[PDB]
Write a protein that binds this ligand. Structure first.
Ligand code: GTP
Ligand code: ACP
Ligand code: GDP
Ligand code: YJ4
Ligand code: CA
Ligand code: CA
Ligand code: CL
Ligand code: MG
Ligand code: MG
Lengths: 256, 424, 55, 437
């Protein structure tokens, strides 16, 4: 059996991951302070990266990337965009910024009927080998109160004569690829003594010309209830069992 | 760094005598005392337990003690009985009658100063004395009562040296008298205070191992001692042979004993054998931790290991040894305390014990050892509540309060072993 | 990248490279004091032992 | 010639001392009988190798070293080994019973009996020094002698030689090779006691060196002989500046002014490359760019940690072999673009470089292949504070239950010295954090 610990009980995502892992009959959960674990589902604040990868005979994997804070706190994110040569002036997709002060989108795309404003959240997963996996299911937080990609796509076809892939998704795959390639040297664990994966939540907004802008990145996202079951199994399949194998593809591999 | 061995009583002299036979074969020493071994590894650290003599013969640094002459004469009539220094036989004629008080207070007091004089002569010869090693039983009179007396008086003369005992616990399955719980509770009070490390060889466990594992329907004392001499050979390996770990008694005590009173170790051995296939290193490891291979009738899954020391003997891949030892800890990490990091230490020796080509010996300081002290405390109270058989002790000058003090000190020991079983 | 203070020898060279610029002794008495305060504590607890053994 | 005294304490110190002085003798052409044919100055000289070796009228070169172990078994094999003729019997000092992996036993109980003996035999060496620089001290954190007796020795060397500088090479405890369960206790105690008496301390984590021998030399179960001959390679390139003609790190004072701006933060992280197996029949000779790149990979460091999430205060690169200056400036250029190297703001971002042309020497028949160029990078990064955090966490797990404390107070120590030394380490962890954030 493989062993894991859970040190963030308030995590709705990895709670479901803990359930599925235990249901395998090949994973068993240890006490939080038990060091002899394979997989850590660690805390959000002051996660002790410095003590991982030091137990002999144990391959250790954690569900966070040390240094990902540089992309998930909006203060760090704006500093990263302006200073980074790999981005900087080339960003036509990050609103001008100096919480912190940013421009406002005068011209949002308005879903109708009802003149509705929205933002889009897609979930991205980065495994221990820094392959970038975009979850084919996203969701628009419309102003339940959630529109999914099948509806939004058919709206785009019948309202504006284009598809979700061409109008918006292309830019999204470019933005996700661009930020994560930037900090890859800073946070990769490819030749470290422990390994990292992490689930990310990218938030986008679309203006009235079908141009996508990046609002913020969240390092500990929740999912939509409809989709919890499919994404959490993919985390186990692609990020956890890839390292600890057992006895369709809901993801899109973003190439680099 | 020399060790002085002392054996007291029938059980102590019998398990002690088998111990010296076993290790004398491993070091290639014959009953005449002369050496006939192939490897100079056998002679390298032989000074720990043997004294070099004229004609380059080796004489065990052993003192044989009893209050009856019979057992000593049988050791002298034994195969290796000639090897023991004739002066190191210290005996009397009265006997102790399975009465702790006769060994500790009355009959034993006369002989004790004689034994200490033999100890002193051996000690003065020593260049650097590690400490002492005592084989005895806790349920008789001589080993239980006079043995704990000698420990008390050795500590007075040598306060800085280490006291290590192999103590055989009584069991109704292999019993001599109904007063064995009285003798055992009284002795444990002493061992708690005056020893640094005690191996709990439980006669109940030895009987069960002979019965249900080795399929011996009615075991002899020799059958049990065969298990004891194997364990005693396994746990002294790192003292007698050069290895990766060149060990002594104090370093063992420092690393195995987190709190001074919790120094009662569960021995274990694999493979269990009756008086040609060799075990693969994974088999050795699985059996060595198996409760069915413990020399104390305690379920280690009912407790948690505070510390663990394990020995492997034979020619095997040290890589596979630590892959397998790490595997058990990583697979059963619940049963090891999280507040003592890396509390399992393995050693490897190339020379296997006679007969087997691969072997594993286990020394555990597990909190499950309190099952053994509960059992002896339950038998003790059943009698003491009604003061039964107590006149055999009050007629030798003892008081009921001294029984009360031992009962409660041992019941404290059990609660202390339970404190840490639940601490986080 | 500037290179500074190159010193050559028969055995080797030494230099510096810059990419970006910037932006009570305890006495023998005291140690011997605590060294003896520990030995007095040692022999105190031994005396307590030899008196516990005398009783 | 300003001279240097080496002191080796405990088993780890004595056997690593064995590794280096054996290597030193190969690098300087000194035979196990003390004879040096390259040396035509018979009986004297102000050469740079005389900083480490004295000369007899019989032309013998003897180490300016002293070995100290409270147990004789390990120093005895130096007395009967291949380099027995090398040392005078007086500079090999042994006691009767060791410290039983107990800091307090080595510091107080057994330390007080032998402290004056070695300081006498040290001063015998210093009286033969026209201008003593200081001392190189080799020991383990976990050993009772290596922790307890060293910290007493470092205390009394500060009194008797307050002007001279003390450099420390320390073996940090690793469970894969550790012998004792209380090594975190000894480590915190000796570090606290020695902190203000050591001018510079190079830690070597046994686990780092262990997995380098597994990964790069392809040894399934490394021994101390493997680890030490690797360790000595790093030790040799660190001390190479004092034994050969150089301009970089020619005196022990330079190690401080170059690497240690903050007295307490005097623990530089060392990174060495290449480590090539001798069994590898044909090894691609790694360029200067490739072995300078490797110095920033965590897998080649002496302490497992990630410098990417700390900040540098200094950085030396010591090259041994066929290395030309503009070769390294091109390699420095390319790696600064592709790696996360944040110096602190109040320090310049750069490197001090020394090149010694003589390639690394390896032990014949050893498991290290001879390479034509190698590099050792000493870097004072705050990421080394992780190694403290790990050690302190282990200390905290045991001390909350007071496990094994009685062995220490039984030797006359006070229970408060534990929490004293522990909050010194709690202060050391925050001093690191303030610099690096
Ligand atoms: N690299 C290396 N580490 C060693 C060597 N010998 C011991 N160690 C390490 O040192 C620690 C144990 O300390 P020792 O040096 O053996 O103990 P000591 O200094 O002799 O002190 P005592 O034996 O307790 O009196 C453990 O962490 C070992 O892994 C060695 O030869 N090379
Ligand atoms: N630059 C911006 N322009 C318009 N809305 C923004 C914005 N930044 C954040 N928001 C809004 O705040 C929140 C997102 O859902 C988005 O709608
Ligand atoms: N394992 C073992 N136990 C023994 C042996 N002899 C006696 N015992 C046990 O030891 C206890 C009796 O102690 P004994 O040595 O005979 O009395 P003593 O001579 O006065 O100490 C009883 O519990 C017996 O079961 C022996 O040779 N081997
Ligand atoms: C009496 C024989 N002596 C001896 N001593 C050992 N030691 C001493 C030591 O140096 N370290 C050590 C650390 C431990 O940690 C949990 C446990 C034990 C030890 C030892 N270990 C493993 C097998 C056999 C051993 N035999
Ligand atoms: Ca007398
Ligand atoms: Ca000369
Ligand atoms: Cl390398
Ligand atoms: Mg009898
Ligand atoms: Mg030692």
């Amino acid at each position: 059996m493989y062993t894991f610990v859970v040190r963030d009980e308030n995590s709705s995502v990895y709670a479901e991951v803990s359930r599925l892992l235990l249901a395998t009959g090949q994973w068993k959960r240890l006490r939080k302070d038990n060091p002899r674990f394979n997989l850590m589902l660690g805390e959000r604040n002051r996660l002790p990266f410095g003590r991982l990868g030091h137990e002999p005979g144990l391959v250790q994997l954690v569900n966070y990337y040390r240094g990902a804070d540089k992309l998930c706190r909006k203060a760090s994110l704006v500093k990263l965009i302006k200073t980074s040569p790999e981005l900087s002036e080339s960003c036509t997709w990050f609103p001008e910024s100096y919480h912190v002060i940013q421009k406002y989108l005068e011209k949002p795309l308005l879903l109708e009927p009802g003149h509705r404003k929205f933002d889009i959240r897609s979930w991205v997963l980065v495994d221990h080998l820094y392959n970038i996996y975009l979850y084919r299911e996203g969701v628009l937080r419309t102003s339940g109160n959630e529109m999914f990609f099948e509806e939004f796509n058919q709206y785009l076809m019948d309202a504006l004569n284009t598809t979700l892939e061409n109008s918006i998704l292309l830019q999204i795959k470019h933005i996700i690829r661009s930020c994560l390639m930037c900090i890859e040297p800073a946070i990769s664990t490819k030749h470290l003594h422990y390994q990292s994966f992490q689930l990310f939540g990218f938030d986008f907004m679309v203006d009235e010309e079908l141009k996508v802008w990046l609002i913020e990145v969240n390092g500990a996202p929740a999912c939509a209830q409809k989709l919890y079951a499919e994404l959490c199994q993919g985390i186990v399949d692609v990020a956890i069992s890839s390292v600890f194998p057992l006895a369709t593809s809901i993801f899109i591999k973003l190439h680099h | 760094r020399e060790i002085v061995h002392i054996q007291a009583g029938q059980c102590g002299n019998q398990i002690g005598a088998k111990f010296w036979e076993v290790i004398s074969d491993e070091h290639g020493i014959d009953p005449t005392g002369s050496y006939h071994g192939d490897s100079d590894l056998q002679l390298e650290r032989i000074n720990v337990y043997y004294n070099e003599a004229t004609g380059n013969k080796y004489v065990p640094r052993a003192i044989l003690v009893d209050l009856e002459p019979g057992t000593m004469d049988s050791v002298r009539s034994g195969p290796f009985g000639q090897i023991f220094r004739p002066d190191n036989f210290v005996f009397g004629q009265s006997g102790a009658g399975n009465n702790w008080a006769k060994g500790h207070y009355t009959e034993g007091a006369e002989l004790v100063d004689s034994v200490l004089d033999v100890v002193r002569k051996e000690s003065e010869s020593c260049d650097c004395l590690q400490g002492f090693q005592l084989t005895h039983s806790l349920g008789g009179g001589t080993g239980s009562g006079m043995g704990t007396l000698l420990i008390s008086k050795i500590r007075e003369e040598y306060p800085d040296r280490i006291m290590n005992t192999f103590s055989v616990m009584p069991s109704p399955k292999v019993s001599d008298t109904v007063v064995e719980p009285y003798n055992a509770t009284l002795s444990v009070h002493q061992l708690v205070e005056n020893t640094d490390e005690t191996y709990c060889i439980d006669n109940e466990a030895l009987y069960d191992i002979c019965f249900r594992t080795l399929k011996l329907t009615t075991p002899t004392y020799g059958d049990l001692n065969h298990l004891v001499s194997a364990t005693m050979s396994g746990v002294t390996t790192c003292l007698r042979f050069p290895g990766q770990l060149n060990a002594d008694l104090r370093k063992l005590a420092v690393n195995m004993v987190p709190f001074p009173r919790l120094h009662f170790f569960m021995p274990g051995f694999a493979p269990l054998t009756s008086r040609y296939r060799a075990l693969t290193v994974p088999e050795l490891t699985q059996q060595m931790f198996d409760s069915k291979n413990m020399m104390a009738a305690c379920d280690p899954r009912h407790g948690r290991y505070l510390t663990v020391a394990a020995i492997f003997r034979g020619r095997m891949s040290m890589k596979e040894v630590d892959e397998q030892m790490l595997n058990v800890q990583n697979k059963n990490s619940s049963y090891f305390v999280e507040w003592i990091p890396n509390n399992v230490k393995t050693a490897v020796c190339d020379i296997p014990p006679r007969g087997l080509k691969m072997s594993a010996t286990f020394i555990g300081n597990s909190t499950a050892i309190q099952e053994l002290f509960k059992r002896i405390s339950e038998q003790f109270t059943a009698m003491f509540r009604r003061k039964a058989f107590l006149h055999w002790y009050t007629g030798e000058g003892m008081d009921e309060m001294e029984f009360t003090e031992a009962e409660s000190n041992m019941n404290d020991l059990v609660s202390e072993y339970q404190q840490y079983q639940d601490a986080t | 990248m500037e290179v500074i203070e190159l010193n050559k020898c028969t055995s080797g060279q030494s230099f510096e490279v810059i990419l970006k610029p910037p932006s009570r002794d305890p006495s023998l008495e005291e140690i011997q004091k605590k060294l003896e305060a520990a030995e007095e504590r040692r022999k105190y607890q031994e005396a307590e032992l030899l008196k516990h053994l005398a009783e | 010639m300003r001279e240097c005294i080496s002191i080796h304490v405990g088993q780890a110190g004595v056997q690593i001392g064995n590794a280096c002085w054996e290597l030193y003798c190969l690098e300087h052409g000194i035979q196990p009988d003390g004879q040096m044919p390259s040396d035509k100055t018979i009986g004297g000289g102000d050469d740079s190798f005389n900083t480490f070796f004295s000369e007899t009228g019989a032309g013998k070169h003897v180490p300016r070293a002293v070995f100290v172990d409270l147990e004789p078994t390990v120093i005895d094999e130096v007395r009967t080994g291949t380099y027995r003729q090398l040392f005078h019997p007086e500079q090999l000092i042994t006691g009767k019973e060791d410290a039983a992996n107990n800091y307090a036993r080595g510091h107080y109980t057994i330390g007080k009996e032998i402290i004056d003996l070695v300081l006498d035999r040290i001063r015998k060496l210093a009286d033969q020094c026209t201008g003593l620089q200081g001392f190189l001290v080799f020991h383990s954190f976990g050993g009772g002698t290596g922790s307890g007796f060293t910290s007493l020795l470092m205390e009394r060397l500060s009194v008797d030689y307050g002007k001279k500088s003390k450099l420390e090479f320390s073996i940090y405890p690793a469970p894969q090779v550790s012998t004792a369960v209380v090594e975190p206790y000894n480590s915190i105690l000796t570090t606290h006691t020695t902190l203000e008496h050591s001018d510079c301390a190079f830690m070597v984590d046994n686990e780092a060196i262990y997995d380098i021998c597994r990964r790069n030399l392809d040894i399934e179960r490394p021994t101390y002989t493997n680890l030490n001959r690797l360790i000595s390679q790093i030790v040799s390139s660190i001390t190479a500046s004092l034994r050969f003609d150089g301009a970089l790190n020619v005196d022990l004072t330079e190690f401080q002014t170059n690497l240690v701006p903050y007295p307490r933060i005097h623990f530089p992280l060392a990174t060495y490359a290449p480590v090539i197996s001798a069994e590898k029949a044909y090894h691609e000779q790694l360029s200067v760019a490739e072995i300078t790149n490797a110095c920033f990979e965590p897998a080649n460091q002496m302490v497992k940690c990630d410098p990417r999430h700390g900040k540098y205060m200094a950085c030396c690169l010591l090259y041994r072999g066929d290395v030309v200056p503009k070769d390294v400036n091109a390699a420095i250029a390319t790696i600064k673009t592709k790696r996360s190297i944040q110096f602190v703001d109040w320090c310049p971002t750069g490197f001090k470089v020394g090149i010694n042309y003589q390639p690394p020497t390896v032990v014949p028949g050893g498991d290290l292949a001879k390479v034509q160029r190698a590099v050792c990078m000493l870097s004072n990064t705050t990421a080394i504070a992780e190694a403290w955090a790990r050690l302190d966490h282990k200390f905290d797990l045991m001390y909350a239950k007071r496990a094994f404390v009685h062995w220490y107070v039984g030797e006359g120590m006070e229970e408060g010295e534990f929490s004293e030394a522990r909050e010194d380490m709690a202060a050391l962890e925050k001093d690191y954090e303030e610099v690096g954030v």
